[PDB]
PDB file of C-alpha atoms and ligand atoms in Angstrom:
ATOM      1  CA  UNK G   1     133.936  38.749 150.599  1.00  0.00           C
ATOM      2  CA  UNK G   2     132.414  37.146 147.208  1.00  0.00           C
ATOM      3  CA  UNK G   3     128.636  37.997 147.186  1.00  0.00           C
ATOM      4  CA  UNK G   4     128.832  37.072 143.440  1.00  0.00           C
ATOM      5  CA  UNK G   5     125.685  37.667 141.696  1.00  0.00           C
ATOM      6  CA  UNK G   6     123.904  35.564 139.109  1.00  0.00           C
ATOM      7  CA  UNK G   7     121.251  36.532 136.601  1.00  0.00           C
ATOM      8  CA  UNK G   8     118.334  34.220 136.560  1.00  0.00           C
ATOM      9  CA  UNK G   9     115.792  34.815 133.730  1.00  0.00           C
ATOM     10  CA  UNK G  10     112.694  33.540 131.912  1.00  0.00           C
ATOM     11  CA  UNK G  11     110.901  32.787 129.093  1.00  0.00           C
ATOM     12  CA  UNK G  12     107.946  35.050 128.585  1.00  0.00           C
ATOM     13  CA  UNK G  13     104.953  34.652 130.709  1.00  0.00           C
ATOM     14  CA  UNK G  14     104.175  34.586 134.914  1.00  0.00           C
ATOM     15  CA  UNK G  15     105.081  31.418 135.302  1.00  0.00           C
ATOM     16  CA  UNK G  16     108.951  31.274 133.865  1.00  0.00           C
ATOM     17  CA  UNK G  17     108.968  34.845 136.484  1.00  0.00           C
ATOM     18  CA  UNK G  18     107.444  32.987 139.411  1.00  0.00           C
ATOM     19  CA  UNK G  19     110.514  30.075 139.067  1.00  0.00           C
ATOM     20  CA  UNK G  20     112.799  32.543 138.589  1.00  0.00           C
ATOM     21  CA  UNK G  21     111.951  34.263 141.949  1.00  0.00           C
ATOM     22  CA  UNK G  22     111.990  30.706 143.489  1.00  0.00           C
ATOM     23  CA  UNK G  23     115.479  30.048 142.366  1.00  0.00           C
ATOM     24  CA  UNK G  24     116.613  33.541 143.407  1.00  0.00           C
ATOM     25  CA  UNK G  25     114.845  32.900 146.764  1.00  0.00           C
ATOM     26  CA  UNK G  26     116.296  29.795 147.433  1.00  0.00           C
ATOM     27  CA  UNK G  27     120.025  31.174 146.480  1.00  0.00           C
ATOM     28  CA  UNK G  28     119.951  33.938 148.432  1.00  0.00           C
ATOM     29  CA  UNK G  29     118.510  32.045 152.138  1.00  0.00           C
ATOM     30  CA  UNK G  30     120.878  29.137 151.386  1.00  0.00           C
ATOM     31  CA  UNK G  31     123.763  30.265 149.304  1.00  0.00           C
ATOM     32  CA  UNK G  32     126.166  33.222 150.053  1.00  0.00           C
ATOM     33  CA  UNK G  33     125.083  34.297 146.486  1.00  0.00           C
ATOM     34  CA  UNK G  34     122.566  36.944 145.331  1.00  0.00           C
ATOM     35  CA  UNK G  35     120.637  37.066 142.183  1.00  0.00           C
ATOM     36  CA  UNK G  36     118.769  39.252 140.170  1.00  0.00           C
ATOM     37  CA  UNK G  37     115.282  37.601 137.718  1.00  0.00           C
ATOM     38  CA  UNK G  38     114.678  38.550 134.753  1.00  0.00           C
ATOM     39  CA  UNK G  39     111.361  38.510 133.970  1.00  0.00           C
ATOM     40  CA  UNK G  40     109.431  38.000 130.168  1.00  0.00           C
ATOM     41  CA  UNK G  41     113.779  38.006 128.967  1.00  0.00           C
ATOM     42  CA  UNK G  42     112.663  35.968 126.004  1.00  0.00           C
ATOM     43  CA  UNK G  43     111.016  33.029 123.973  1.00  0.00           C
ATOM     44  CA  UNK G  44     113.576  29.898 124.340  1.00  0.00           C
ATOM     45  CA  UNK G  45     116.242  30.021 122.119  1.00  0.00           C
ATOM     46  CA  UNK G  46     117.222  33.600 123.398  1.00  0.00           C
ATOM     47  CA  UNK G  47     117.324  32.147 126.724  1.00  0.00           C
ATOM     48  CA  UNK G  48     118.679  28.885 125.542  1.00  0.00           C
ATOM     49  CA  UNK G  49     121.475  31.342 123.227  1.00  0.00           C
ATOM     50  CA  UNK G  50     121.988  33.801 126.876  1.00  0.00           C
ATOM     51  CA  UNK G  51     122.676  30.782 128.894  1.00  0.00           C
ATOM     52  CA  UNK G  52     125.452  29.049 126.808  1.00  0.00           C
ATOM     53  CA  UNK G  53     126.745  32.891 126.027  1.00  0.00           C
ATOM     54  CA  UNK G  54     126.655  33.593 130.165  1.00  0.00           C
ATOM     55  CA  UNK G  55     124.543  36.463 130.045  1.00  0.00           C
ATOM     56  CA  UNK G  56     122.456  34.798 132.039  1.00  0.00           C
ATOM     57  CA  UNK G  57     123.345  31.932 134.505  1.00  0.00           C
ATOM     58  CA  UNK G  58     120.007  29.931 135.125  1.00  0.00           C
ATOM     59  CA  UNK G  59     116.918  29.967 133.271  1.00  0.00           C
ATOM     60  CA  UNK G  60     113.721  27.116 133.787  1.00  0.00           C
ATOM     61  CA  UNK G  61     113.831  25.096 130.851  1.00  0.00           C
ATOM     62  CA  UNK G  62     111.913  22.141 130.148  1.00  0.00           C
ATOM     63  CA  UNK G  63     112.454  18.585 129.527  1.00  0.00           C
ATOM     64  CA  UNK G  64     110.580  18.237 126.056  1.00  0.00           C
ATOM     65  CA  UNK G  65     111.694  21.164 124.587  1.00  0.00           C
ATOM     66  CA  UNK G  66     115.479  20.688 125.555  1.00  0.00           C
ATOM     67  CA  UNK G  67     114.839  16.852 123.030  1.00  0.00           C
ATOM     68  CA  UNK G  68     112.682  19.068 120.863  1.00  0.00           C
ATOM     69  CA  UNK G  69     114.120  22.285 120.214  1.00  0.00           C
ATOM     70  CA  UNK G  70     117.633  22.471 122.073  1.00  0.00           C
ATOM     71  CA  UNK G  71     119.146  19.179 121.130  1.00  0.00           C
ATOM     72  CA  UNK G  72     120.303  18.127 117.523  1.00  0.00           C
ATOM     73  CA  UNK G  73     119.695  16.255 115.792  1.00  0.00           C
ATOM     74  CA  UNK G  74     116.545  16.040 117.886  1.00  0.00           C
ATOM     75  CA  UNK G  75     116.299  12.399 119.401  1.00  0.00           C
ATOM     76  CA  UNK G  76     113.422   9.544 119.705  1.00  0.00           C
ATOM     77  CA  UNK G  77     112.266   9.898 123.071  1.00  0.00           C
ATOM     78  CA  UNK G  78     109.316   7.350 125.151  1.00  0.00           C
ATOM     79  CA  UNK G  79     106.513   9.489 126.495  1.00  0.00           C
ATOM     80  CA  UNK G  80     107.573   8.612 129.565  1.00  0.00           C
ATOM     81  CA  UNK G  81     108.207  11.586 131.651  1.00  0.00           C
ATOM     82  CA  UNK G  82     111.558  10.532 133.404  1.00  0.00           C
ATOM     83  CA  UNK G  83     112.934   8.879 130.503  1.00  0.00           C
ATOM     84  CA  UNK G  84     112.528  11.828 128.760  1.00  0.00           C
ATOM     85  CA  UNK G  85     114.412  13.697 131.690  1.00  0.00           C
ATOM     86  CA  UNK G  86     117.056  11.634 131.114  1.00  0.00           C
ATOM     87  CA  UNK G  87     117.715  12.142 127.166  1.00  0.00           C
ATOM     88  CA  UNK G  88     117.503  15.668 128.192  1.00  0.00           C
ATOM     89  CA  UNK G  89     119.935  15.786 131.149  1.00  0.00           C
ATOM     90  CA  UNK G  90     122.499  13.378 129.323  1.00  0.00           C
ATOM     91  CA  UNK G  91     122.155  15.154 125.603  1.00  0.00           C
ATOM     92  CA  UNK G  92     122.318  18.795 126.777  1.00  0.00           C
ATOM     93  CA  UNK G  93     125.594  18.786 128.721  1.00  0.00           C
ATOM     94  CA  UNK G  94     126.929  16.366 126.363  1.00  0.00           C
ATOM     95  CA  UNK G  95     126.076  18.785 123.219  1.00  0.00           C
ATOM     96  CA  UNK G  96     126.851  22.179 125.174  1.00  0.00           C
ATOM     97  CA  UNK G  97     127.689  21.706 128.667  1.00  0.00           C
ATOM     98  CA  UNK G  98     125.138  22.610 130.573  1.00  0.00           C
ATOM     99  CA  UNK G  99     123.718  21.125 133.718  1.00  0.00           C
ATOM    100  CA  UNK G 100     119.924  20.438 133.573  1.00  0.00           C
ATOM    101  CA  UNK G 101     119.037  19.633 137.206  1.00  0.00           C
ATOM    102  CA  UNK G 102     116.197  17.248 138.346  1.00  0.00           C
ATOM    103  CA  UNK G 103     112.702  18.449 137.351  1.00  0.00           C
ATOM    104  CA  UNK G 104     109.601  19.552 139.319  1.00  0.00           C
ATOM    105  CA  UNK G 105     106.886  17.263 139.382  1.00  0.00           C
ATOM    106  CA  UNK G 106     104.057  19.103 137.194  1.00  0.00           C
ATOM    107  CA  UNK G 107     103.742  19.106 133.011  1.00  0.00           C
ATOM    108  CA  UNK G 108     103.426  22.054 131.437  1.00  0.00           C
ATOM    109  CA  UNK G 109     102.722  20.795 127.970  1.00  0.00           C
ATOM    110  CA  UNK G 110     101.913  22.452 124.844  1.00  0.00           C
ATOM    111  CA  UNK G 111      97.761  22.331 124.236  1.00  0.00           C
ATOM    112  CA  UNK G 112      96.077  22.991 121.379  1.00  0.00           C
ATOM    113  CA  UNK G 113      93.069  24.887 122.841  1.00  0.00           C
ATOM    114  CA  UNK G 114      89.737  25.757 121.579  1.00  0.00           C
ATOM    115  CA  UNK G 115      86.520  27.481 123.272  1.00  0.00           C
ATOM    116  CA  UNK G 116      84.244  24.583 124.969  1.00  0.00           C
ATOM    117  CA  UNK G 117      81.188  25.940 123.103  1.00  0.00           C
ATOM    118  CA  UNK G 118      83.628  25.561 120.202  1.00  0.00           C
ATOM    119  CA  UNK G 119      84.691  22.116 120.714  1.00  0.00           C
ATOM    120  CA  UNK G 120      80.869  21.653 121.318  1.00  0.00           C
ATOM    121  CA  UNK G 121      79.625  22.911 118.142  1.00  0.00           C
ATOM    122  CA  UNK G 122      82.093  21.581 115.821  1.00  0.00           C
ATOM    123  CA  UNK G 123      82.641  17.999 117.478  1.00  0.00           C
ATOM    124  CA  UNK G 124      85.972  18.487 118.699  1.00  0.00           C
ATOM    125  CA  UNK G 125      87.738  16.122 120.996  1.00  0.00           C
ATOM    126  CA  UNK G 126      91.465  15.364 119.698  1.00  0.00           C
ATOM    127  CA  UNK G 127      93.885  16.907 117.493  1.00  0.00           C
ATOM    128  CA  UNK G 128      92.625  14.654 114.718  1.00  0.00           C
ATOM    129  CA  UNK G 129      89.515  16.541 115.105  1.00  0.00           C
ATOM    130  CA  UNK G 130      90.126  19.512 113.786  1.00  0.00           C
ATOM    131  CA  UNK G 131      91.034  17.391 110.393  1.00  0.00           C
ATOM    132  CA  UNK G 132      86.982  17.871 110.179  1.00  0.00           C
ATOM    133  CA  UNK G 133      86.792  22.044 110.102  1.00  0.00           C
ATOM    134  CA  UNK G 134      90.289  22.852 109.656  1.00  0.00           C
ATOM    135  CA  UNK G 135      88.730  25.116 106.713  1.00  0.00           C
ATOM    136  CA  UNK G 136      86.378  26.523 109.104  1.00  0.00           C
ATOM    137  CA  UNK G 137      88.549  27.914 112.200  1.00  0.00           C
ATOM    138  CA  UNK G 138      91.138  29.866 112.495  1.00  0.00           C
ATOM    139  CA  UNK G 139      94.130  29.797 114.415  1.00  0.00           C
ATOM    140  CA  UNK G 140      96.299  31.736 116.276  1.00  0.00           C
ATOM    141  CA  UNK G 141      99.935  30.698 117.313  1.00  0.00           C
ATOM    142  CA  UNK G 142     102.678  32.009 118.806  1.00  0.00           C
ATOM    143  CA  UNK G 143     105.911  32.292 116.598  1.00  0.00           C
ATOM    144  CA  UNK G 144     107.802  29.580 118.230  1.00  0.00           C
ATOM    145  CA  UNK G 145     104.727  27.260 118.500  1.00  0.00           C
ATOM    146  CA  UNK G 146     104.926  28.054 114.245  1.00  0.00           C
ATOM    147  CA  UNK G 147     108.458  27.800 114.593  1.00  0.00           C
ATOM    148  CA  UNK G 148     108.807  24.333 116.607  1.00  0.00           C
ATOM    149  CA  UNK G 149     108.914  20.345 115.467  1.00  0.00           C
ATOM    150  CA  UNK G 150     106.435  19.680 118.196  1.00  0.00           C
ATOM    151  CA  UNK G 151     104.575  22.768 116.971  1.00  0.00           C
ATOM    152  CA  UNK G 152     102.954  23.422 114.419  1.00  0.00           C
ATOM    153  CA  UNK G 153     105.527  21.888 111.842  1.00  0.00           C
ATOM    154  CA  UNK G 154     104.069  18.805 114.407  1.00  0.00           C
ATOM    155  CA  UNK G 155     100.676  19.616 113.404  1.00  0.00           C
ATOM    156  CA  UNK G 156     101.389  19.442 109.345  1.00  0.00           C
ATOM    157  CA  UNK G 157     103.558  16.504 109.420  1.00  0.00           C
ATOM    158  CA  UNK G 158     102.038  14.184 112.694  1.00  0.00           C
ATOM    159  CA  UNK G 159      98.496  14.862 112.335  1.00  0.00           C
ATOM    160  CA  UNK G 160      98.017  16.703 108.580  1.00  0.00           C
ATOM    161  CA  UNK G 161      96.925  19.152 109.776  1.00  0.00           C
ATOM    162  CA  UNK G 162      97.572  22.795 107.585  1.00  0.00           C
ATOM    163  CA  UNK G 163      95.588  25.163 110.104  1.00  0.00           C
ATOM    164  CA  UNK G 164      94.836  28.683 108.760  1.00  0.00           C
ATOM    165  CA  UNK G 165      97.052  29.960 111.227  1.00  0.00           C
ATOM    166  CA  UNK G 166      97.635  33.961 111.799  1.00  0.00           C
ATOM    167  CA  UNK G 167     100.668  34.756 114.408  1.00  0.00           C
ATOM    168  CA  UNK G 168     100.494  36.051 118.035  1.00  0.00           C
ATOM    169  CA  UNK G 169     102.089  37.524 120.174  1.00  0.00           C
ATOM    170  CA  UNK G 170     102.081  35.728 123.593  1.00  0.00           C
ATOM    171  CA  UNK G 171     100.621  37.939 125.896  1.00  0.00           C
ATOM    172  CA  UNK G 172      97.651  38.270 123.148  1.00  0.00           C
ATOM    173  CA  UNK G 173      96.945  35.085 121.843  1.00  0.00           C
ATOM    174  CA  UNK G 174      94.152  33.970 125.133  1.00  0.00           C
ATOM    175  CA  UNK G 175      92.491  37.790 124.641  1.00  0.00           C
ATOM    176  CA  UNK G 176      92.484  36.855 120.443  1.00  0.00           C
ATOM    177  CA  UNK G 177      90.617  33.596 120.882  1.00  0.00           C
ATOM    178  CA  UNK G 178      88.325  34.863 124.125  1.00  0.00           C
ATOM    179  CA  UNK G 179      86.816  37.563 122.001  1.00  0.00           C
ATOM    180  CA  UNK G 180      86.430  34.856 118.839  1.00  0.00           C
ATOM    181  CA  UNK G 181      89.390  36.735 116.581  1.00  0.00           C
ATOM    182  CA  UNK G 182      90.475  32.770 116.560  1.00  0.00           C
ATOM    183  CA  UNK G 183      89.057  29.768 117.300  1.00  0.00           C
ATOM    184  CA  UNK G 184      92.160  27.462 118.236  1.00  0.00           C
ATOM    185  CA  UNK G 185      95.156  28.861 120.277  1.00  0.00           C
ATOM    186  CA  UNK G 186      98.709  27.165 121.475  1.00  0.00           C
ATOM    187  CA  UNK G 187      97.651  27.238 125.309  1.00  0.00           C
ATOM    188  CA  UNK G 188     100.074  25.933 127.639  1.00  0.00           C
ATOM    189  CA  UNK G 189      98.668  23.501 129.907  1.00  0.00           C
ATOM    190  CA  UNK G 190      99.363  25.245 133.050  1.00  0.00           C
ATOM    191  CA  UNK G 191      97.870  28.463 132.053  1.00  0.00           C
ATOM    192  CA  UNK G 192      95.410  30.432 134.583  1.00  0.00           C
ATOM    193  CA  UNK G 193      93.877  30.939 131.019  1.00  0.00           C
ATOM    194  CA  UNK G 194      92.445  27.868 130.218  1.00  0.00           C
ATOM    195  CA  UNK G 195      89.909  28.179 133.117  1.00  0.00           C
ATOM    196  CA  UNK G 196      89.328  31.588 133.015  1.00  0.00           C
ATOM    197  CA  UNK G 197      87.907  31.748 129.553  1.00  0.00           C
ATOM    198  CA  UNK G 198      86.353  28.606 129.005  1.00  0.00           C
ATOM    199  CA  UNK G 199      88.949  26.752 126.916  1.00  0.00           C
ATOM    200  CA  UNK G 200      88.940  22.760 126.061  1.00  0.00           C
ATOM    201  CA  UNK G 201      92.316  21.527 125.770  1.00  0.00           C
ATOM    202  CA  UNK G 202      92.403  19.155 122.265  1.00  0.00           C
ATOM    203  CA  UNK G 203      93.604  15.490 123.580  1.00  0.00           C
ATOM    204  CA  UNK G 204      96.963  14.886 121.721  1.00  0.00           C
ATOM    205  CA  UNK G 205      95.143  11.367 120.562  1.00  0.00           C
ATOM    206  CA  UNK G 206      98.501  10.864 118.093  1.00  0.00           C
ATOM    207  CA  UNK G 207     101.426  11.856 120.831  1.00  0.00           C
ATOM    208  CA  UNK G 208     102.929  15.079 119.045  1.00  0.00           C
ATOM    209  CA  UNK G 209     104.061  16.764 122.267  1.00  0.00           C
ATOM    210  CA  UNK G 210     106.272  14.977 124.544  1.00  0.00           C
ATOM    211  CA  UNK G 211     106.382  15.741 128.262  1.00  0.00           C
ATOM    212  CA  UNK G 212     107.718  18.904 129.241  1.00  0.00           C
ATOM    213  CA  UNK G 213     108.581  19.485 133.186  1.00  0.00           C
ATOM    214  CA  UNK G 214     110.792  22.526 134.021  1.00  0.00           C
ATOM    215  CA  UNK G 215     113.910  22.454 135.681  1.00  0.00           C
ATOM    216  CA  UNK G 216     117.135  24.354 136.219  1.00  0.00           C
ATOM    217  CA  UNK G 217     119.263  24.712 133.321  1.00  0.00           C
ATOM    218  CA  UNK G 218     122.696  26.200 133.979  1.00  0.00           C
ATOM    219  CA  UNK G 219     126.222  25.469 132.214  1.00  0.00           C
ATOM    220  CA  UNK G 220     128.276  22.721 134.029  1.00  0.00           C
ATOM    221  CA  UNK G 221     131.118  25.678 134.777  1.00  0.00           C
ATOM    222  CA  UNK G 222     128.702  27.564 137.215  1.00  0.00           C
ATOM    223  CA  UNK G 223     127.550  24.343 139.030  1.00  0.00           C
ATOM    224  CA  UNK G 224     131.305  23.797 139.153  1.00  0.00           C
ATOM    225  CA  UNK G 225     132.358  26.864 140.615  1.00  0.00           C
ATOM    226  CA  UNK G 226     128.760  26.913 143.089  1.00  0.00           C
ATOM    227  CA  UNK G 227     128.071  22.687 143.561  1.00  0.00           C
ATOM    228  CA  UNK G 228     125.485  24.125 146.842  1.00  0.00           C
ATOM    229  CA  UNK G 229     123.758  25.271 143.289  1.00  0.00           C
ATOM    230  CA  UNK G 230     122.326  21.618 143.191  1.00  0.00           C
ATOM    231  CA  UNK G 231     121.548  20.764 146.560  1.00  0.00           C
ATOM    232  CA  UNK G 232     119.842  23.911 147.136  1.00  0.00           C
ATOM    233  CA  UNK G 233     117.777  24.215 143.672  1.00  0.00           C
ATOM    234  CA  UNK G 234     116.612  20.747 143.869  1.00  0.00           C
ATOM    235  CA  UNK G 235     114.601  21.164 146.381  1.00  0.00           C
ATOM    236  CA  UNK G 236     112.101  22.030 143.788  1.00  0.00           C
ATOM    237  CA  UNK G 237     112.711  18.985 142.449  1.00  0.00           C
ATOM    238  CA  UNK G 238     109.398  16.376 142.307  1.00  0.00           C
ATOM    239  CA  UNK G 239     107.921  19.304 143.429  1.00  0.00           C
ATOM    240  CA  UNK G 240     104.404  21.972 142.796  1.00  0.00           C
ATOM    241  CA  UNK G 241     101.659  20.043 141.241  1.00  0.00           C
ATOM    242  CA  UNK G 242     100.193  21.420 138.324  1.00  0.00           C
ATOM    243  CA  UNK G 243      97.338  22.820 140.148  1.00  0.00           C
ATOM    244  CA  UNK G 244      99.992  24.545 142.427  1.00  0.00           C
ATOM    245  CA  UNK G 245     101.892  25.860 139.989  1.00  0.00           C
ATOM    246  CA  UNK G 246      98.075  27.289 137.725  1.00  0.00           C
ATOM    247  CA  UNK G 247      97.153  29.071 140.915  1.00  0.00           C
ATOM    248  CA  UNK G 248     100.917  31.406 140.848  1.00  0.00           C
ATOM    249  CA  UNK G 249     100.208  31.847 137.299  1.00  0.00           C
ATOM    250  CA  UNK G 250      96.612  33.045 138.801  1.00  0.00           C
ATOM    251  CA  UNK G 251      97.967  34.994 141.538  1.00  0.00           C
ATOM    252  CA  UNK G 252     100.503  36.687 139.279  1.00  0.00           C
ATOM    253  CA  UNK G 253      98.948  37.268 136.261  1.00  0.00           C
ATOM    254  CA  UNK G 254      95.312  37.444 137.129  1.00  0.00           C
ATOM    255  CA  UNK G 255      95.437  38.791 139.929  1.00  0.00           C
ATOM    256  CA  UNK G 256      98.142  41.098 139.289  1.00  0.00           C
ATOM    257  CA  UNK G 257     100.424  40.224 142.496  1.00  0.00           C
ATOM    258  CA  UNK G 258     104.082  40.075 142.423  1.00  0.00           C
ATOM    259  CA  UNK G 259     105.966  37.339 141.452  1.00  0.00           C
ATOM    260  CA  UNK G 260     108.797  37.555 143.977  1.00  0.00           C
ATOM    261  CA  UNK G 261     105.933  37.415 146.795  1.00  0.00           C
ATOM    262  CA  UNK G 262     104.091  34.760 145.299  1.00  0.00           C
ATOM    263  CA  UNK G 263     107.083  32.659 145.148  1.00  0.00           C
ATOM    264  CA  UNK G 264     108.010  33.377 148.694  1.00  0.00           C
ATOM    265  CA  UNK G 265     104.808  33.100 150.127  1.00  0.00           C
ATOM    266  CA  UNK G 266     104.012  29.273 148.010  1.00  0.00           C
ATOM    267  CA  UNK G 267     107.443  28.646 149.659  1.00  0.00           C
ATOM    268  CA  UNK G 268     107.143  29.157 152.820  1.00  0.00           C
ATOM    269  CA  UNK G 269     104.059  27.564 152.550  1.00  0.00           C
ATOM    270  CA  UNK G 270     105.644  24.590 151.412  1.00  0.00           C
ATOM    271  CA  UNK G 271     108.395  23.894 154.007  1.00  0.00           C
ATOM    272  CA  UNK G 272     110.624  24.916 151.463  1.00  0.00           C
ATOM    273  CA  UNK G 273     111.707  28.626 152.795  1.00  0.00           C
ATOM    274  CA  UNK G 274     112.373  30.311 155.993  1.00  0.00           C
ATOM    275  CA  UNK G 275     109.040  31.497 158.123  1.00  0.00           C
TER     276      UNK G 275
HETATM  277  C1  LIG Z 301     106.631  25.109 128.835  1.00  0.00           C
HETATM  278  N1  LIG Z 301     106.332  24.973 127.421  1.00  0.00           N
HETATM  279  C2  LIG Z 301     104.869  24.984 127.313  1.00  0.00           C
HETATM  280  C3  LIG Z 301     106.744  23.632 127.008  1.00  0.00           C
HETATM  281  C4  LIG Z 301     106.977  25.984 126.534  1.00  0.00           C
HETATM  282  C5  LIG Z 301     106.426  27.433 126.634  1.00  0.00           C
HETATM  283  C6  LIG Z 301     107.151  28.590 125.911  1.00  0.00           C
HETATM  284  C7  LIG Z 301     107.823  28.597 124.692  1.00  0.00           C
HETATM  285  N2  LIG Z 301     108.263  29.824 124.489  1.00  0.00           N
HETATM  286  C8  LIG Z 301     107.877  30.580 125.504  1.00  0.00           C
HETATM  287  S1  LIG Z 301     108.180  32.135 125.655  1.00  0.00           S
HETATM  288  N3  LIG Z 301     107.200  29.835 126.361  1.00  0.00           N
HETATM  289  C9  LIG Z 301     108.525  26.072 126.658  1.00  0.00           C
HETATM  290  O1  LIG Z 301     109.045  26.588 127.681  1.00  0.00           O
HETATM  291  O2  LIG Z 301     109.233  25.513 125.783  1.00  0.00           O
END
């Protein structure tokens, strides 16, 4: 009986896939429970909108953007990483129910990226830099990073900044500002990206982004109906560095291998599946 099936999905990139594939790995060796990952499913208030609608049942959310985006009003959080965990956990099931289990151990912030030869030429070490040329570069965003607080609405009202900013999609914002289309980019901070093409990450010298560390994020109802849910997904939790987690993004989307077998194999690798 009951091999109930749960749809685990992510926002759009490798690395949202590759947790996905860890959750769905871990259900299905501990759990009498199958899923089924959704990769690239959408940017996060589709996901955050599919989870509370259960059309999906987990996504990786993180603990930043739940105070930032999910949560409102949004509330005055510390920098400090577990803190901030806290605010999230608390606020989120309070405002809609959902369960936001504990988080893994790496940051995957927001990171307002330039070329080094850029940051070199121009003098560019912090946000507050780009004050300096912010007539001279361009920018391109992704819509959400436009569309956030601790976006680019961050970067007007924190730092004054009013970047001439053209849209991206995603998947094309790190080809855009490789070939010199753009000069500044919305990398995230765990990107394979960063290294590959010679970005410097601008040092958020005035705080805008808080930290973000992904977790589970499920409504209380399915953690009620599976409790093993938490026990068995936080394992993750204090868990992959951020250089772990850069080199699945690599493996994935540089290299082209599949996210299900880079989960399994980082895994298994880590004590954390079977063989
Ligand atoms: C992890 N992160 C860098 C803090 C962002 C990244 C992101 C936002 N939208 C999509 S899609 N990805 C997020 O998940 O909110």
């Amino acid at each position: 009986m009951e091999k109930e099936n749960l749809i685990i999905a992510g926002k759009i990139g490798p690395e949202p896939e590759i947790l996905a594939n860890m959750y769905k790995l871990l259900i299905e060796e501990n759990t009498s429970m199958t899923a089924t990952v959704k990769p690239n499913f959408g940017t996060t208030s589709f996901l955050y909108e599919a989870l509370k609608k259960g059309d999906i049942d987990i996504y990786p959310e993180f603990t930043g953007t739940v105070t930032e985006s999910l949560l409102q009003p949004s509330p005055k959080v510390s920098h400090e990483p577990e803190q901030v965990y806290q605010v999230a956990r608390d606020g989120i099931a309070k405002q809609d129910h959902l369960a936001y289990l504990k988080p893994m151990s790496y940051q995957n912030t927001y990171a307002v990226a330039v070329p080094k030869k850029i940051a070199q030429e121009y003098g560019l070490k912090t946000i507050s830099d780009l004050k300096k040329v912010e007539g001279q570069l361009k920018a391109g965003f992704t819509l959400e990073f436009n569309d956030r607080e601790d976006g680019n609405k961050g970067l007007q009202s924190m730092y004054g900044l009013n970047l001439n900013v053209a849209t991206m999609q995603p998947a094309l914002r790190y080809q855009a500002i490789h070939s010199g289309d753009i000069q500044i980019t919305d990398a995230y901070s765990t990107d394979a990206e960063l290294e590959r093409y010679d970005l410097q990450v601008l040092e958020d010298d005035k705080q805008l982004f808080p930290p973000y560390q992904g977790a589970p994020l499920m409504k209380e109802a399915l953690l009620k109906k599976h409790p093993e849910l938490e026990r068995v997904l936080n394992t993750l939790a204090g868990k992959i560095t951020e250089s772990q987690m850069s080199q699945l993004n690599y493996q994935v989307g540089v290299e082209g291998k599949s996210a299900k077998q880079v989960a399994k194999e980082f895994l298994q690798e880590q004590g954390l599946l079977k063989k």
